[PDB]
């Protein structure tokens, strides 16, 4: 209702910020290609501009990473999915980092270097959620986190129900359907504003999603190449697994040597730009885009992969097609150039997300999946040139559907979900290939689940962040006896005047255990300290409402750590007062469960 | 994995049963229309066959409702959403009722009377889930219920992600994402088999969903009729609310009078068939389908409503169109016939779901929504005959999109969800109108949420079933003091030989509280009775492993009933041992919370 009105201002602001950032990104990008073309074709000088614009934007982005942001480097979803699991970092929710991130992420987005988008966008979306929650409802924690995640991804791509599925499907154990309704209304209004604002200020005609991919939708697949879809499940998951593995292969290489550690403490600025430099050394179009089509910034690149005609048959013609004219070298077969494009983007993207940058883990993987898909689609077009017959209509296959289903499959495989297929068909604009892409997505997901861990789980493992995982293993003897803390603070109601002044002057924490007597030791309830301070001081001044809430839990003192973890998971709660016979004996905290489950 | 293999046999069987039932339904239906046409046009005799086939099939269905099924009359989802909230009815999960229902539901489906499909299909899906869970994993309760719900609706309509959203979005408070993954894999394989089996035995070409609705997808909406979409939100929700209200207006009329109660105990068979009779009295095409198009069985009827051309402009021509030729009376404007169709199906469908029949609450409502949508689409086509201009292309509007978005909207409004829009676009086959249908669905949902209760909540209210609801009301003084049961059974470990033989001969229940001493009164844990029986008897025979699990909960004796309800909700648990100082004092059961929250 009126919390819906809170949500509708949230989505309005979030869509204004997203349109702003990709608008300025696209304008900087067209200015880049524009001046690059229009100065002169000078093979020293076009090389000079091809180097000197992307490295200076990435240096600018990394400067904003360094100076203003003390902790927001490498931002994304896994730290906040650890936050909603409990490990709170309020200083990491600073508004000041917010503006410090986003424009650098615009510099990240405006670069021709492959970056993701969604991750730090989800982070700033949860930032705006928390700040507006501070600003409204004065004029529930993981609820605002969850809704911020939903609004962030649905405001990236205009994909509401993919937004809410990408919000639920990993970042929880249980989930309240209230927040489902909240985030679904939020995500649909954020998606709605993002597209109509386009048709307002700029040209957009009507409301296409982003990428109208005009397929024939008349005898689409058929069911003869369908086991080929089986291959594009399993193989993608295979290679996708390797991707995550190789990311660990460089993150350990990030922090294995004292030599580069010493030189990075010596000079932090040196590391990103230079390898940006060297991948630009393989990107320059009359250098290597003769074999790479290096004049493909990724958005229009993947729009060119969704071309609804066979490029091998159009390798037979010299026709000026659309942007797919970049996909012709006049001597080299185009399967080779697609293969080289795929493998070279593949090893560049891990290096791209390696550097100390706010990096989303979705977009270049999505590009790689589209690459592999149109690869196998074009070779199946070469494999069956004949097509089939139908009533006065010869129907040959077309590789655009293969491209979009593989671009679902492989990033779903890396990301360990199925909600990626949802935003995949929602950005493709037609839902012909819906059940085969769901099949292939789940095939790749179970292969990936079998082989290698998640992307973000490997990220928090390597970054060594406090987080409770589990792998369904309850062995013989795990008991909470080396763990509980026997330091107990205590308040009684039958404590009088001097004792209560002493409690003011000796204690500091936010809420306090109330018992009957310290000799009885039995925990009874809990009272906020500051309300007691209020009652004492605002009775002291006029000189010259006591409600008792109950402790919802109690820990039987031989509980196995799996079941203890399960208890805090299903309660969604932090701490444990460990008693026998009510008499308080120990205290178990969250970080000690992590230190326990180290083994 | 191999529980996935459990799931894949489940979905294979479920899709075989669904294809079987609608195959036989369609064959009986085409035989009905076939013999009806081909005997002769005799206005007494065609009236005779028009009566005598539907009432005899409905009598047959009601006979199967009566004799074999003792409790499965009026089956659907709200009893099982009460079961997964706790109120178990194992006798209502009888396999014998299963075959006793489905063929009568086939008789329900094969009738020309408007029935739903999904509800009892969900019920038999959860039946097959439970039975296969008994059969596999010898060769977790609400998990199998939830997955059965998902498989049931996704096996109805071939709509997997709509299946899992319709499984979650009402039938829970919290939800495990494990079951999300389970049911998503299950739902996609059930949807997958349903369509490929079509292309195997019968003709199907390739894999369309059901209803390819060929729209132009080129300048689709535009954003000038978009506030008209606002109307088709709110108005539908308005009228949809009235629908649920009028259902109560007849269900009380079901059980208000002792006269019809006496005559129904006198003769139960009389009630359904005769009103079937009288709505057939308004269905006969040269009687009233001259103004109704009564020769429209509902599936091809709604396919005819998704006609991508303006029937008012084709009221200008005498052209033999497709089945839409039934939409012409040569003297009466077709807006009038659509209006009369809508209002007459509207008051017939509540009477149709009234009778003691397994009735789904989705399909005729979906028909009514499509009716209202094409109504307003045709009058907007009459309102703007000109259309707009674009580059050498004059584009006029078309009412098929209005029909499909209203057919989302109104049944989403009745059903109190948003997942209905998902299965709506997934059966339409194109996703042009995706964000406006989401907007209109949520508009109608908040109007319906504002005005009138849910369909199924009104159903369980009137049928007076034990179920804990809540309406966010925690007043001044609600306390658990008139409620707890002070009858306590007790077991000690230091009880010896004669006492343990006495415990065998005096007690009966499945698991038992273990304490230290009955004088101490403190609850310590719980042990299964039958394992103790096993240890005693299978030690007694060789004459001539004692594990202690802990009680996870304890009730502070002044807990408010809202927070008690909240405790059992978030635990998902049944009972409460109510102690002070560990010493057991009372027992609180589930039905007493319902008897409490009566006020």
Numbering used by the authors:
A (entry chain A), B (entry chain B): 115 to 253, 262 to 591, 595 to 669, 818 to 872
The paper states:
The first identified human member, ClC-1, is essential for maintaining the permeability of Cl− across the plasma membrane of skeletal muscle fibers, gCl, accounting for approximately 80% of the resting membrane conductance and assuring precise neuronal control of muscle contraction. Despite distinct roles as passively conducting Cl− channels and stoichiometrically coupled secondary active Cl−/H+ antiporters, members of the CLC family share a common homodimeric core architecture, with each subunit harboring an independent ion translocation pathway. In addition, the complex gating processes that regulate CLC channel activity remain elusive, with only a single available structure of a channel member, namely, that of bovine ClC-K. Each CLC monomer has a gate that operates independently from the other (also known as “protopore” or “fast gate”), structurally attributed to a specific glutamate, “GluGATE”. Here, we have determined structures of full-length human ClC-1 using single-particle cryo-electron microscopy (cryo-EM), exploiting a purified protein sample that displays Cl−-dependent single-channel–derived ion conductance.
For structural characterization, sample in the presence of 100 mM Cl− at pH 7.5 and in the absence of nucleotides or antibodies was initially employed. Assessment of the 3 major cryo-EM maps obtained in our structural classification reveals different arrangements of the CBS domains, suggesting intrinsic domain flexibility at pH 7.5. Therefore, the CBS arrangements seem to correlate with slow gating, being rigid at low pH in the presence of nucleotides and more flexible at higher pH in the absence of nucleotides, bringing to mind a mechanism that has been proposed based on electrophysiological data. The complete effects of such putative rearrangements are, however, not demonstrated experimentally by our structures, because they remain closed also at the higher pH (determined from particles in detergent environment).
